[PDB]
Every structure is written in structure tokens, then in C-alpha cells.
């Protein structure tokens, strides 16, 4: 109700999440998580996101459809809860084949499931799953720039390996010469330097989030009113662009040792070098074909999603027709003929930037995303303004 209330429902969920944190596991799973299950984490995000996206694929598909009833809503929620347990049992039994975390996991799937639904109702945007993604990403960038308690890459000459930190090196380094230059002792990835670059690539994405088009739009029966439609340049919410890049690399690499039952180095190498190997790379031609292949892949997931579960021609046409929208110079139908162009070209050129986040890893300190923490910051812009309006 109140903006004072609305923040309380966020504190509840905030502090609780703060204390808390194929035939093999998935890459993308590691991205959203940040502990890979700690001693209290008890897979706190994994089920909710796996369940929501299996179900969205099933739901979007034309075979079953969400009608306007209470009833399709109910079953979709029920369906997601049921999948969410299934995936956690499916996973967890495998690591067993020990006494402590198995018993605890069942009590911990009882907390999470209603909690996630405490911030879709108790708060506006975000979601429970969003809030968690944002925190877990922001976590692992900051811990390595302050004091990692493991090892601090870039600068070394100590083989303790267990208290080597960024602040710990800052004290020993003043008793000699600078290593805060473009010179470092072993330059694997200087971690102070990697953060400066992190915040650079953030800057070009938010620039394009300000790019969106608004339209004023009149109604049919009575022409004397005007409403609005916002057309957001981005599409598919950027989730099956980031996810689908990853999950096709799994299905090749798992299979290689599976084919043997029925070679880590060579087979991987020659099909896809992973990520960048710097501004000088490591391959004069192997890295090039990979990058060009990647952007093609990512551009293509967007153009296939929109028709079959996403929003495109028909899903937008249904929307306007309800309230009988018409165009000033034309009609209903022929807005649809201009977003036949727009939706594919905007969508997939959107994609070619969610791809050009993922290859960076030496100018980006994020654990895979991109997408998931940035959807969180866009949602802050929306809520931050709401709080400035009421205050003034």
C-alpha cells in the first residue's frame, strides 16, 4: 500500500537471503548461485529459476495456454512448486551416492517457496528470484577487490595462498616499489584493475536501456482520447539468450565421455575455444570463427523465441484489440505490420550485446551475467523514482 510498507516487505526478504548465502550439472547454474550450496545456502535460488523456465517453455507453447481464469494461474503456480522440489531431489541424491545436509535441505525448501511469493505480492518488481541474482552477482565482484582470503592474482611473490589479499598486499607493497602500474609480478588478472574495467561495460548497456520508444495512441469508437504504448527495444527479458549460449556448450562437452561408454583437450579446442584470451588472443583464426559463431547463435535464439513463447506479432495484436486501439492515420492491423519488422531486428541486435558481455571476462568480473543483475538495476530505477515522487 504505502512506500514505507513496500520497503519493509523487501527488508524481510533481504536479510533472510543475506544470512542464507543432462547427466552432469549445468554451467549456468553456477552463475545464479555463488556458493554452489554452502552450509545454510541449501540451494536457495536454483529450483525456483529451473522450475520457472521449464514451465514457461511448456506454457508459451501453443498446446496449452494461460486464459483469463483464476484457474490457469493456480495450476501454473502449482506446476512450478512441484518441478522445484523435483529438481532439488533429482540433484541432491546424486552427491549422496552426507547425514547433515540431506535432512536440512527438506526444511530449507519450505522456507524459499513461499518467500519468493512474498516479494511478488508484497513488493512490486522485483521478484524473489531477481533479488537473489542481483545480490549473488554483486557479491563475487566486490569480495575479490577488497580481501579474498584465498589468493590475490595479478601480483604475487608469496606462496602462502591463504591470506593473500588485495589489502594484505597493499601493506607489503609500500615497503618496496609500485605494482599498481600496468606492470605487475605475474599479471594473471590484476583484480583492482579488473573492477575498473567492470564498471565500464555497465555504462554502455544502461545507455541503450534509455533507448526505448513511446507512442501516443487513440481509440476507435471515440477518437477524442489518447493513451500510450511503450515499445521496449530489448526482448525475451534477455534470459534465454544468456542461458541458451551456455546450455549448448554443455550438451557437447558432456557427451564426449558418454560416447566413450557407448577427451577433454582436443575435442573442445577445435570446436570452440572458450571466451577471450585477451586483446591479443591466443588463436589467429580459431578464436575469430568462435566469436562470429557465438554472435550468430545469440542472435538466432531471440528470433526463434518470440514466435513460440515470447511476444511478437500476435501477442501484441491481442493486447491492443481489447480496448480497441487504432492509429491516427491508419488502423489496428497495420501497427502489427510495422512490428513484424521491429521485433525481430531490435530483439536480436539486443542479443548481439548480451553475447558481447559473455566473451569479456578480462574486462568484466561478473561470474557469467550480464542480464540477471542488470534487469535488477533497471528495476531499481523504476522504484527509486517512485520513492522520489511521494517524498517530494
Amino acid at each position: 500500500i504505502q512506500f514505507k510498507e513496500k520497503v519493509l516487505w523487501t527488508a524481510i526478504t533481504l536479510f533472510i537471503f543475506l544470512v542464507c548465502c543432462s547427466a552432469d550439472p549445468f554451467y549456468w547454474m553456477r552463475v545464479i548461485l555463488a556458493s554452489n550450496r554452502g552450509t545454510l545456502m541449501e540451494l536457495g535460488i536454483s529450483p525456483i529459476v529451473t522450475s520457472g523456465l521449464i514451465m514457461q517453455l511448456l506454457a508459451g507453447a501453443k498446446i496449452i495456454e494461460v486464459g483469463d481464469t483464476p484457474k490457469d494461474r493456480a495450476l501454473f503456480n502449482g506446476a512450478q512448486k512441484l518441478f522445484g522440489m523435483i529438481i532439488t531431489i533429482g540433484q541432491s541424491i546424486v552427491y549422496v551416492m552426507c547425514l547433515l545436509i540431506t535432512i536440512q535441505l527438506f526444511v530449507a525448501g519450505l522456507i524459499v517457496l513461499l518467500l519468493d511469493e512474498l516479494l511478488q505480492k508484497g513488493y512490486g518488481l522485483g521478484s524473489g528470484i531477481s533479488l537473489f541474482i542481483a545480490t549473488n552477482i554483486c557479491e563475487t565482484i566486490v569480495w575479490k577487490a577488497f580481501s579474498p582470503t584465498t589468493v590475490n592474482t595479478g601480483r604475487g611473490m608469496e606462496f602462502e595462498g591463504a591470506i593473500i589479499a588485495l589489502f594484505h598486499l597493499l601493506a607489503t607493497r609500500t615497503d618496496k616499489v609500485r605494482a599498481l602500474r600496468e606492470a605487475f609480478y605475474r599479471q594473471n588478472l590484476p583484480n583492482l584493475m579488473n573492477l575498473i574495467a567492470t564498471i565500464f561495460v555497465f555504462a554502455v548497456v544502461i545507455y541503450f536501456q534509455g533507448f526505448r520508444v513511446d507512442l501516443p495512441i487513440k481509440s476507435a469508437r471515440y477518437r477524442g482520447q489518447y493513451n500510450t504504448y511503450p515499445i521496449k527495444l530489448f526482448y525475451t527479458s534477455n534470459i534465454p539468450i544468456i542461458l541458451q549460449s551456455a546450455l549448448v556448450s554443455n550438451l557437447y562437452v558432456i557427451s564426449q565421455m558418454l560416447s566413450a561408454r557407448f577427451p577433454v583437450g582436443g575435442l573442445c579446442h577445435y570446436l570452440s575455444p572458450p571466451e577471450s584470451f585477451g586483446s591479443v588472443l591466443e588463436d589467429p583464426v580459431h578464436a575469430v570463427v568462435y566469436i562470429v559463431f557465438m554472435l550468430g547463435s545469440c542472435a538466432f535464439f531471440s528470433k526463434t523465441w518470440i514466435e513460440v513463447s515470447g511476444s511478437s506479432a500476435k501477442d501484441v495484436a491481442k493486447q491492443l484489440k481489447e480496448q480497441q486501439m487504432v492509429m491516427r492515420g491508419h488502423r489496428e492491423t497495420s501497427m502489427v505490420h510495422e512490428l513484424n519488422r521491429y521485433i525481430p531486428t531490435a530483439a536480436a541486435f539486443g542479443g548481439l550485446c548480451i553475447g558481447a558481455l559473455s566473451v569479456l571476462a578480462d574486462f568484466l568480473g561478473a561470474i557469467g551475467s550480464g542480464t540477471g543483475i542488470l534487469l535488477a538495476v533497471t528495476i531499481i530505477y523504476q522504484y527509486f523514482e517512485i520513492f522520489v515522487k511521494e517524498q517530494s
Binding site: L99, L100, V107, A108
Partner: protein, 36 residues
Amino acid sequence: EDSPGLKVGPVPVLVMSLLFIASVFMLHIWGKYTRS
């Protein structure tokens, strides 16, 4: 069961806290909160 449409109120907050405290403390073997 799944009949509730709404999922906010005092009561869900008490249920999440009550469980969260057994998870943190009761089942741990490290601090000797239960013995086997």
C-alpha cells in the same frame, strides 16, 4: 493447500523465521546441538 490466492500477512513471516532458526542451529553436528 493451494487455495490461497494471497500469500502476504503476518502468518507467513512467522513460519519462515521459525523454520530458518532450526536450519541454522538444531541439526548442526559441529556445535553439538544434537548427538549421534
